[PDB]
A paper describes a structure:
The [name] domain from the C terminus of [name] (Pena et al., 2007; Zhang et al., 2007) forms a complex with [name] and strongly stimulates its helicase activity (Maeder et al., 2009; Mozaffari-Jovin et al., 2012). The [name] sequence showed an N-terminal region (∼470 amino acids) of unknown function and two consecutive helicase cassettes, each containing a helicase core with two RecA domains followed by a Sec63 unit. Here, we present the structure of yeast [name] in complex with the [name] domain of [name], which stimulates [name] activity.
Yeast [name] truncated at the N terminus (residues 442–2163) was crystallized together with the [name] domain of yeast [name] (residues 2147–2413). The structure has been refined at 3.1 Å resolution to Rwork/Rfree of 21.4%/27.0% with excellent stereochemistry. The yeast [name] (yBrr2) in the [name] domain complex is similar in architecture to the free human [name] (hBrr2) with Cα root-mean-square deviation of 2.8 Å for 1,545 aligned residues out of 1,707 residues of yBrr2, both consisting of two structurally similar helicase cassettes forming a compact entity (Santos et al., 2012). The [name] domain (residues 2147–2413) of [name] interacts with the ratchet and FN3 domains of the N-terminal Sec63 unit (residues 1011–1309), burying 1,536 Å2 of solvent-accessible surface. The N- and C-terminal helices of the [name] domain are gathered to the same side that covers the bottom face of the Sec63 unit. Superposition of the [name] domain in [name]-[name] and Prp8885–2413-Aar2 complex structures revealed a steric clash between the RNaseH-like domain of [name] and [name], which accounts for the mutual exclusivity of Aar2 and [name] (Galej et al., 2013). The structure accounts for the reduced binding of these pathological mutant [name] domains to [name] (Maeder et al., 2009), and therefore, it provides detailed insight into the molecular pathology of RP13.
Numbering used by the authors:
A (entry chain A): 442 to 1825, 1841 to 2163
B (entry chain C): 2148 to 2395
Amino acid sequence: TVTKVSLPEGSFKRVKPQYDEIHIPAPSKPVIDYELKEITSLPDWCQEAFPSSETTSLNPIQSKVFHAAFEGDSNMLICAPTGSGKTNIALLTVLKALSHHYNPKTKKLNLSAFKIVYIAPLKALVQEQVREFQRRLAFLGIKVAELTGDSRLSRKQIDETQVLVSTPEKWDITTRNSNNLAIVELVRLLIIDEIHLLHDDRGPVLESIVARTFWASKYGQEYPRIIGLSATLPNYEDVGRFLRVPKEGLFYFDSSFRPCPLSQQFCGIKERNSLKKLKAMNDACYEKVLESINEGNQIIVFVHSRKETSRTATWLKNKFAEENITHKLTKNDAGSKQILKTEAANVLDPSLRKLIESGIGTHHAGLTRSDRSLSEDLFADGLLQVLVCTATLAWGVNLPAHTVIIKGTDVYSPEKGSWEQLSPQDVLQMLGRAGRPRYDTFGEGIIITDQSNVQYYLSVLNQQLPIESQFVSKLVDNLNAEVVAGNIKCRNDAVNWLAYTYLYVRMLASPMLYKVPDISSDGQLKKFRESLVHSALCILKEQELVLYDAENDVIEATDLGNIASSFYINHASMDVYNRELDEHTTQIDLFRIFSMSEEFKYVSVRYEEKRELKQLLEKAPIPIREDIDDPLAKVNVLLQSYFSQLKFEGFALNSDIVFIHQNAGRLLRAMFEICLKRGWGHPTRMLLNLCKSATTKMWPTNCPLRQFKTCPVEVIKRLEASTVPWGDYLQLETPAEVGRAIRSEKYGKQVYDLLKRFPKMSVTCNAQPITRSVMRFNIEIIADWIWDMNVHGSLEPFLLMLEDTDGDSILYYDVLFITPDIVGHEFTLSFTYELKQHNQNNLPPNFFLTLISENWWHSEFEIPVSFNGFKLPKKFPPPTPLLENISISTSELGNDDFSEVFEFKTFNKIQSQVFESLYNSNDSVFVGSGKGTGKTAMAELALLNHWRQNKGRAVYINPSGEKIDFLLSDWNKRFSHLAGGKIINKLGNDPSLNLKLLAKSHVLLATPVQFELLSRRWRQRKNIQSLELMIYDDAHEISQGVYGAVYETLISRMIFIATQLEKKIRFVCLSNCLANARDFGEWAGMTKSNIYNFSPSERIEPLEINIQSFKDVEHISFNFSMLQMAFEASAAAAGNRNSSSVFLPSRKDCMEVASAFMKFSKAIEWDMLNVEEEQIVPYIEKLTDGHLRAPLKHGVGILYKGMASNDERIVKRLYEYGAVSVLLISKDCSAFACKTDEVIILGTNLYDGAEHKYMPYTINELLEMVGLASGNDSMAGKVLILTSHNMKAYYKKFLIEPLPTESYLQYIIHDTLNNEIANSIIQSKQDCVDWFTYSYFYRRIHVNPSYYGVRDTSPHGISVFLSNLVETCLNDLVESSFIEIDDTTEIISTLSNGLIASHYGVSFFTIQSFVSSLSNTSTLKNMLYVLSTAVEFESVPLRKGDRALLVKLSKRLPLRFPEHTSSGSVSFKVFLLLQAYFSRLELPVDFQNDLKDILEKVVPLINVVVDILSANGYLNATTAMDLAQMLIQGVWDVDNPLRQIPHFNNKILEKCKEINVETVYDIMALEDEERDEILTLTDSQLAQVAAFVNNYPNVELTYSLNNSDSLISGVKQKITIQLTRDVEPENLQVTSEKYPFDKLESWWLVLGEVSKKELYAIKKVTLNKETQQYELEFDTPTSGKHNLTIWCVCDSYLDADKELSFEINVK
Amino acid sequence: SKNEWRKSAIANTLLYLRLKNIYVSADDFVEEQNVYVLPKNLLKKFIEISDVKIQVAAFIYGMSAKDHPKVKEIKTVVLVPQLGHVGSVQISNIPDIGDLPDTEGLELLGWIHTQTEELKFMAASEVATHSKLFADKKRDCIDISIFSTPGSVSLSAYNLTDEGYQWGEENKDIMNVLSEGFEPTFSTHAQLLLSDRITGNFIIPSGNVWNYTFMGTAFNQEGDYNFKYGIPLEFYNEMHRPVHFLQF
Ligand SMILES: Nc1ncnc2c1ncn2[C@@H]1O[C@H](COP(=O)(O)OP(=O)(O)O)[C@@H](O)[C@H]1O
Ligand SMILES: [Mg+2]
């Protein structure tokens, strides 16, 4: 048991009566094989980093380490003497790490790439390094920050910073956070200071930290550089192994190398009893102090408490006067005293001053900041001979003395509830003060302690107390955290992990110490590891932190374990919280449960303090059930005290209480977390306060004026007694009024300002029953405070709960983070919650919805959510089952020619039940089947059986113009011949052209918008009326928004038209599985027997759907952790030889995920393409878009909207064959049927920067993706969904039970009604309600009125609702001058302003907006702004960080956005991209698409603008027309005329200028030899230039005024205009290189007077003939002379327009 | 000692256990007279927020169904500023709740309160208070008396006769000893049914505090107070005790 400490040569022992002292001389100089490295030899930037060290060179230790530190990148462990200069050593390694990023040639320094972490044991020291590092590394312009002492979400930000100075624990919690995985990747330098802490009971934190950096890195693959800094102590060998330091980088410095070598001395006090022991030390201390003073040396005395400093300092003072007192007063009475006694007076308040007059200071915290800074600086300056210190000096300051005495080494551990000996690292920190390196020849360290301890502290200061692992003690807690990080699933992961621990390196090496059974059997302790892991796991399972099956061997992560890890809570404490926390847990109990925490196991009520404690236990505000014997009562009463900030006399107890508040926070939070998860409303609510109460160090029952640091102390006291409700003071909106309530004037104006800074919300919430069981809640919130940064920080978070009526059951929760950009402006939240059966049968009166500030007292705002009138819809009737037989075969269809077409000979299981009804009958049919069931073949039947009966004509309707394009060509090759039938696609963009295609075409394919626009004038269009068959595909999308409404508007009209004309039209509706087809089918007019509708599970290829939720992910699209699981699934696909595609919400995300996939694939055995790399390079050669080349190469495909078809097919083919194993696909391209075996949907969120939020996918968007999985033979496809927890419930549910298909028609009723009015289908008001009865809306408001907002809920109620619905609409319509009503019950008649809306498809809202924003003085730039605000563009995306780009783009464009509007709106995007179009700027593929979609919408809108302005007689209608042209050709009006000609680059344009060709006609005229030289272009390009130039118009404009002689003022005069071409044109198909849509040529005849800016007349015409003429009619102006002008203006070409000025006289 | 309450406050934590024993006074059903239906959730809560020793009271509002005009369902319990005692309680006036949502056509049906003396008839503080509240306003208002004791709660519904009211009007004040003129026959069994198939809710003062024991100076017994739907505070809830947090 005896382990005698070897003492260096020269050591000796003196025996004194009171204490045996033993002496260790300062060591001799080492062998000098070094040069102090002067700073000037450092590269020139660095040199700054070392400004004015007294030496101007590195000391011995630093100089020897400099090579490996600064020129090496190897890992390092440096063991050295106390006070050896660690900062500069750390600094050298820092600078090296920086070097790897900045360019040596470039001035610019990269700052985003590198994160540097410096771990240090105590906050005192952590802060110190932050200050020191900031000062020194200021010049390089890097940020040094203390890694945040308290909070968690506000850590995500602090990567504003480049140097993070943490304690081990803060960095353990940070790095143990699943979401921070993103940022651990940038950490390149990890400096662990005081690495010999490993031996302390805190040391396992360091083990966990390192075990995590090496072992858990995985796919990311690059470990940071590690530099350990240590005290010289046994086992440094094992330590350097533990942190993978190779011999190059291990250093150990003997005491010879301590700059300022240190002499030690150990007084071993021997007195037994307290009085005489205490005296012994005082004397012992006095002697040593005297000696040091008699040698002209200064001295620092460390004591355990803050009161000790002042009483020790006093003893000395007095004992010095008891004999002399000359010795320390001054160096000289003349020199010092006036300089001391000046300074002694000025800032000194306490008894400190009577000490300072005597030249001895005291120094502790809880002492005035100026007062301790005097002490430091007077002692520094020689004036104080003796500073008496608490331990903080040792970590905080840099204040050396020649001598340092530890008086006593007794310390109080509140953790251990007991007195204890100084830890080794404290003693070594303290002794690092001893010896001023610049000045002193040597230094002296004196420990004073009980003889028992002397042997121990000898070993510590003489390199003989070994560093040993305590990892077992914290093993259970630390294992759980890796289990929770998901790096352990099976216990082999656990025994590998343990290999990166210090424990392990240390067990191998001294197995007897660590009680190994048998190393020789166990080898590298594999059975031992496995056994520890087991026992650990079982105690975890026992407590429900994990799920464990020994036999199976599956480790699983509980929600409770997940709290324990995240909040850094002891497993045992989680147990207590588990059992004790209840639905009926109470405030009084919480305090008890709190006090039951493992963290407070050792707290004991000691005899002496018990009397004082009883005083507090009976004044305790919350009852304490427990005795004053019980420890729990102490912890409880202490915590209640902290909340009341009670003054404590005893030191013992005051330390205890401190210990409590520093844990109280995160324990109470862990408690809160559990109750919130478990749903318990009332304890959750209460815990949230306790949490507040522990932040704010105050109780709930206090007005929060006390919470503003910036309020006076008197003002709150008057308001607290005055009993006026807290909220009451808040209501007053007047600054004088608030002051009257206070009863003070000047405090009344300042508190008004404070009040406005107090957080408040407005909440409204309605509810919508989706099904019977499922209620959606739609909330609208406004945040009402004025932001101050000092008072609110970066954000104020807010708990939102929806709770039952009792207020005991949390039904939904979510946390809202308000930020300064969020306050003041409204936002919306929606969520679903599934009603319990009880409540399903009898709705409760209300639920509650509550918002509570996490931070701000009495900022809770709750509102009742009524269910007053509500009808829950009736439960879903079961889906129509399938008769079992696949019998039908292509042979069964009569004709032989038809059979060739289908290219599969057997019909599908689902296709068979239909086949009869589809092919045999001419009955209208409805089919509801999952995607991938081959409903297209169902459309094709109806078509075959249409033509088999020689019938007329058919229309096929789909929303996806992508699908229409594919399916045109498929159909067109296969069906063209079946009797000679002509099948044409409708492009929406020219209605006139579409009309013409109807006439040409036997089958039309169109989109609901397109066709609805055609169909509106069916009363006039006989070709629509004569329609025989209509396939409505994907009809389930009538649900889907404005365009859904339009689909339903469409489908309703065909019924109304059939009904009206007693015309028999076959309707075949193809669709997803609906939940209730009855209503839908009935609305389409289908006999109950023809309404086939199947369960979603029916789809024939088997398909498994795995859904995985994920924490804190609602915030973003997907996080690192989800991406990893996506990659595991893709690897699992690769291993089974199955192919997997992965769905992502953007193109960026496809690129970014590819990049991770390459990195992850390299760091695995499987990185295979499955094909040779030389063969892939011929393919990749096409390089249409370079970004795709790089990923494709490694086995990964990319599909986004806007690809080159080259790219598209090159990528598809490589997948098709099996070259590339994995495809990544935009949510958008989900339409492209690209079948695979496995599907991964990686994230289910979309950002729109319209509502500045993430939005979840709709079940459609999922079903369009789930339908890609298919099976091979028996094999079942697999789908993986990766979502937020909240969303999982909804997705799982409605992926198996269809989402009710309701109607969006209320949202477009204005246009709808105004339209059928305009076309005279509605002329009365009864007509309007009759009209409704043909809608799906109608059928839906009867079955689920509450969903629509019908309060009355009764057929009377609903019927009233509808009539008020038309009336409200009709009101708006007349009020905006779309219609008028007049007596014939009444006739409704459209005005122009609404007839123009009906005619172009443009919205009611958009016209309204234009009429207000347009004027006779409107500029072009205005009409562009006006345009950009059309409500039509709301579908146009705003991606994450488009405003950023858009701003930069703004800089390059000619026209500034009206500054008086917001920069975020889509109006902004629309505004610029239309300029990027006119100025032919290259755009990113994403703005290319946006621009295309923008351009779809514009020709209607611009024509509306021209037709508004012209109706109002204004002549700036023409500067609209200029715009119309600019839109078709992709140019400015200002641009050179030639530029519109296709493919005419600047170089072609410039050659045109040399020749003096100026106009398009000059180009027609060009000679062949000049042509062949200018037009340097491909055969196809020339084709267009040809096409353009032939088509380009040259029209001659002539008139004749009927009687130009007899002009009378005020009559209707008529003018005849004639228009002559050179030849009747081929067609009026417009040629434009830039406009991506079809366009007919049209022309505006304009008559007007320029001087008066006034348009007299107008006519829109098409010059489809060699010559034409038209008559205009206009009111003659006042008598006199008038200079009139005619214009003939084309809408599709620039510079082609003609004008004719004449004059008239009016009588 | 001052801290009589500490002992009671600890007691009230287990007050939820009294709800495994719920007894309702019953007699022969009469379809000629009314039946009062009290949702079980309201009872459970109202006890949970009550004291073990001091009386606690609230108004009840409800309304008839179509099925039977004589089945009065209690919909809402309105908890109002009040000052409790052992064996009696001072209650503020009938709240104005007209201007709250969902209050369409509620009748004030009466009051409901705790007590610590099981009787078969309305007692003398009951009759005083019942007359004080309802004498000149609405005579048919019932009283639901809850006998709450360790183990259980026992409910009992009464009407008051006009002799009762008159006698109560005569007694502006009640003393411990006077006991003058009192009759157990003043009150008559009213038909009470507890139901778990309807759920009612609470209306609480807007200031949130209903228990003005430790604030007995500020208690305004004819106060014009404001009200909202909401979850009622417990009897010894910190907000009902500003004063105890001043010592600390
Ligand atoms: N009887 C059949 N045998 C084999 N393949 C079929 C059959 N019917 C359809 N298909 C094919 O199966 C796929 C699914 O058809 P699709 O029209 O996409 O289904 P849905 O319209 O339900 O989404 C298509 O490739 C289609 O060509
Ligand atoms: Mg389809």
